[PDB]
């Protein structure tokens, strides 16, 4: 309208947006900093970066932008482009890229009392350190540090924002249910806000918004843990295969191939930081070492099975341990022509008897192999169960604290 033109011309005749609004030399401008989370886009762990879509709820008072609405047909507030007024250089300090400032410069709301309100939107990429120890059963603590890049505590005073009917401060990230998309991989457990000072520097002050988020590990559960469990079952099963089948090595070494394939699968998903080993990688390495030991013991069992008196002499300790003691514990418990013809028959009988003795010793060796294989079966079953259960409970006992401490 014409009156809005007149009011704008009156307000900005000598107004300098470069000058901070201070009634008297030494006054401080109180700036209220609030945050509204519209969408928690990503939490890329490879680069340790959180992408969010937010609004900044900024509020301050500019004494120069005051007018009497009675003299202007009762105009109570104006929508003035954000570049025409002084604004505090509120930026995200812990950004991962070089983008400190907002993205969308929505025009400010100025009221006749001098109260300026600004709610610019931004897509921010902040840097939060990732605690890779319980990944993917992990909760993260990603912060967003906001302060004036230019002005210090002697020039502006940061404060928390007020609720819709401003009576008390809002000390949290605001989430508008009408416009808010759940991440689908992250649950927001706490979202507090707090002001922070620095003992060394008395001119520093910021408002930090903390996001405590817990991951939903269903994807990783399926795609890594279930196949690993099946491979561990196969590694245990190798000790039930008879050595005569000639398939022990196939089973065990193919299981090892499968585990290394799963390692290749997981390579491009785990963060590449060296402060700790994520629990999923620990479980993969434990399964890999278990499968390798199953291969080693399969080789030993096959070696024992294929022994004979022609190559090995069975020692006393092996016989005592594996044939006398272990089985009950493991529940196994096992005329010239006539003279020539007579000599030929006698020789045949002698050969058969020698073969019988040789076969008996071979069967002793094979029984030792069987008992050793059963012992390894039980030992590996126990080890695998205990280790998997321990790792899984350790993973499942990792929960964010009830109190955010912020």
């Amino acid at each position: 309208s014409v009156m809005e033109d007149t009011l704008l011309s009156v307000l900005f005749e000598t107004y300098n947006p470069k000058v901070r609004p201070a009634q008297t030399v030494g006054d401080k401008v109180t700036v209220r900093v609030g945050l509204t989370l519209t969408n928690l886009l990503i939490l890329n762990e490879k680069i340790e970066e959180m992408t969010t879509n937010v609004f900044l709820n900024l509020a301050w008072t500019d004494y120069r932008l005051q007018w009497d609405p009675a003299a202007y047909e009762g105009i109570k507030d104006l929508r003035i482009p954000s570049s025409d007024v002084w604004q505090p250089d509120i930026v995200l300090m812990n950004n991962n890229d070089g983008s400190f400032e907002i993205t969308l410069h929505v025009n400010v709301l100025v009221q006749h009392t001098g109260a300026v309100s600004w709610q610019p939107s931004a897509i921010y990429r902040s840097s939060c350190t990732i605690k890779v120890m319980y990944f993917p059963f992990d909760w993260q603590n990603c912060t967003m540090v906001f302060k004036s890049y230019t002005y210090d505590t002697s020039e502006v005073t940061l404060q928390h924002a007020l609720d819709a009917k401003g009576e008390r401060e809002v000390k949290e990230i605001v989430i508008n249910k009408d416009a808010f998309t759940e991440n689908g991989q992250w649950s927001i457990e706490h979202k507090p806000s707090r002001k922070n000072w620095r003992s060394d520097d008395p001119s520093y002050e910021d408002v930090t918004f903390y996001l405590i988020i817990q991951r939903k590990p269903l994807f990783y559960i399926v795609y890594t843990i279930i196949p690993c469990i099946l491979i561990s079952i196969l590694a245990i099963l190798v000790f039930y295969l008879p050595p005569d089948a000639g398939e022990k090595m196939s089973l065990s070494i193919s299981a090892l191939l499968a585990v290394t394939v799963f390692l290749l699968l997981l390579a491009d998903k785990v963060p590449e930081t060296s402060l700790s080993v994520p629990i999923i990688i620990r479980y993969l390495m434990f399964i890999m070492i278990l499968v390798a030991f199953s291969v080693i013991l399969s080789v030993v069992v096959l070696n024992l099975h294929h022994r004979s008196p022609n190559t090995h002499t069975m020692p006393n300790w092996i016989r005592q341990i594996f044939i006398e003691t272990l089985p009950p514990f493991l529940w196994i418990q096992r005329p010239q022509d006539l003279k020539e013809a007579v000599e030929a028959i006698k020789y045949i009988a002698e050969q058969l008897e020698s073969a019988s003795e040789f076969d008996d010793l071979k069967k002793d060796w094979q029984y030792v192999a069987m008992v050793a294989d059963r012992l390894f079966l039980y030992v590996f079953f126990v080890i695998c169960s205990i280790g998997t259960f321990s790792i899984f409970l350790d993973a499942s006992h990792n929960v964010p604290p009830d109190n955010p401490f912020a």
Binding site: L230, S250, V342
Partner: protein, 425 residues
């Protein structure tokens, strides 16, 4: 050129302030009618849940300052003015991914002598729409483009859907406009519904910028051909190969190799599938469910082949063939399964010993054969029990997948089609 004089009068002589709403009194509302035209659907890459689209935003409003008497000038009935010279309603896509809220190309506005202003800027928008992986790759998605006016509150400008006329009665355009001739179908996605809605939020207040909204929805269905050909059919066939392990005789020392190789191929398919989907945890994808089920079944097949081999290679020197086992696995199940002079004295003693040894060997061999028959019976039972499970599970999973059409009517509680063919009334 009279256009120069007219524009000078409109903008310079009249002192046009582009930062002021076109209202005679600062309590009226500027009505901005907007519409969306989809030039082409570029992508819906599911890894980061981004919908890239080429759209043309159509804007229309009145500006009483941009009015003139066409006779006082030459009969000039229309003008083209750059948007940087006139007041423009800043309508921004709120749910964008990359930080692009505005249109790509700020084209000229068109102004009539009565103040009617139309603006048709084109844009590339990268909006966020979450992906429902429940029935992947037989899934349909419901992506949205949400437009808000963040420069003025609802008391100052009202967003509305644009209107059109057919036979003297105007109706709102409650859908995305698609030109049947120019529009080229996406390679992977088919558009099923394309409604448009003006959403009010009564829990907010009119004196705010989060009270009004105009949303355009794209209910699109994936075309499941790449995945069916390259992922589903080869995996299904290789999995069916696992049942042949039971038909493979134990003498051929390759049962375990066959089953384990099937498992390895399925692990490769798991690696391929893991890269195609986001990391979300709302549900397990259909293909993921099938892979888990089939891998578990193949592991069961491997275990049961191991058990059969353990049975086949038992001997009288290490195991006892109990009567219970004989009755169960040699009589009952095979029927149920429809299965198919001292020198001469020394010579005499030696021949007797030979005969005794041969008889003992024959008994050993026949009991080994009994163990072999037991193993064969176990194979037949395992096949009869597992092959139907595999087939039925596969059929059920993938017919459930193939029966996942979109609801054929958006906004479940709404009886309106939001189809461009049948405008309301």
């Amino acid at each position: 050129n009279e256009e120069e004089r007219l524009i000078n009068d409109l903008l310079i002589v009249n002192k046009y302030n582009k930062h002021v709403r076109p209202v005679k009194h600062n309590n009226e509302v500027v009505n901005i009618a907007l519409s969306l035209t989809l030039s082409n659907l570029i992508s819906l890459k599911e890894t980061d849940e981004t919908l890239t689209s080429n759209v043309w935003m159509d804007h229309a409003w009145y500006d009483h300052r941009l009015t003139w008497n066409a006779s006082e000038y030459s009969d000039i009935s229309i003008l083209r003015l750059p948007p940087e010279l006139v007041w423009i309603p800043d309508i921004v896509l709120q749910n964008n991914n990359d930080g692009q809220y505005h249109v790509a190309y700020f084209c000229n506005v068109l102004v009539r002598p009565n103040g009617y202003v139309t603006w048709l800027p084109p844009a590339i928008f990268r909006s966020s729409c979450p992906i429902n992986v429940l029935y992947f790759p037989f899934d349909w998605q419901n992506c949205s483009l949400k437009f808000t006016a963040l420069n003025y509150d609802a008391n100052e400008i009202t967003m509305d859907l644009m209107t059109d006329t057919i036979d003297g009665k105007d109706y709102p355009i409650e859908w995305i406009i698609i030109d049947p001739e120019a529009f080229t179908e996406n390679g992977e996605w088919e558009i099923i519904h394309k409604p448009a809605k003006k959403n009010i939020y009564p829990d907010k207040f009119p004196n705010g910028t989060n009270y009004q909204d105009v949303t355009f929805y794209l209910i699109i269905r994936r075309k499941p051909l790449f995945y069916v050909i390259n992922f589903i059919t080869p995996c299904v066939l290789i999995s069916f190969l696992a049942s042949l392990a039971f038909y493979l005789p134990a003498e051929s020392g390759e049962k375990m190799s066959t089953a384990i190789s099937v498992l390895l191929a399925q692990a490769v398919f798991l690696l391929l599938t893991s890269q195609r989907l986001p990391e979300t945890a709302l549900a397990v994808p259909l293909i993921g469910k099938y892979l888990m089920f089939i891998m578990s079944l193949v592991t069961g097949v491997i275990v049961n082949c191991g058990i059969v081999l353990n049975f086949h290679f038992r001997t009288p020197s290490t195991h006892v063939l109990s009567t219970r086992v004989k009755q169960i696995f040699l009589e009952k199940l095979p029927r149920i399964l429809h299965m198919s002079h001292d020198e001469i004295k020394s010579g005499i003693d030696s021949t007797n010993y030979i005969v005794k040894q041969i008889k003992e060997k024959n008994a050993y061999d026949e009991e080994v054969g009994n163990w072999n028959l037991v193993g064969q019976t176990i194979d037949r039972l395992s096949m009869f029990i597992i092959t139907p499970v595999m087939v039925l599970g596969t059929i059920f999973i993938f017919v459930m997948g193939n029966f996942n059409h979109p609801p054929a009517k958006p906004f479940e509680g709404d009886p309106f089609d939001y189809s461009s063919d049948h405008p309301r009334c």
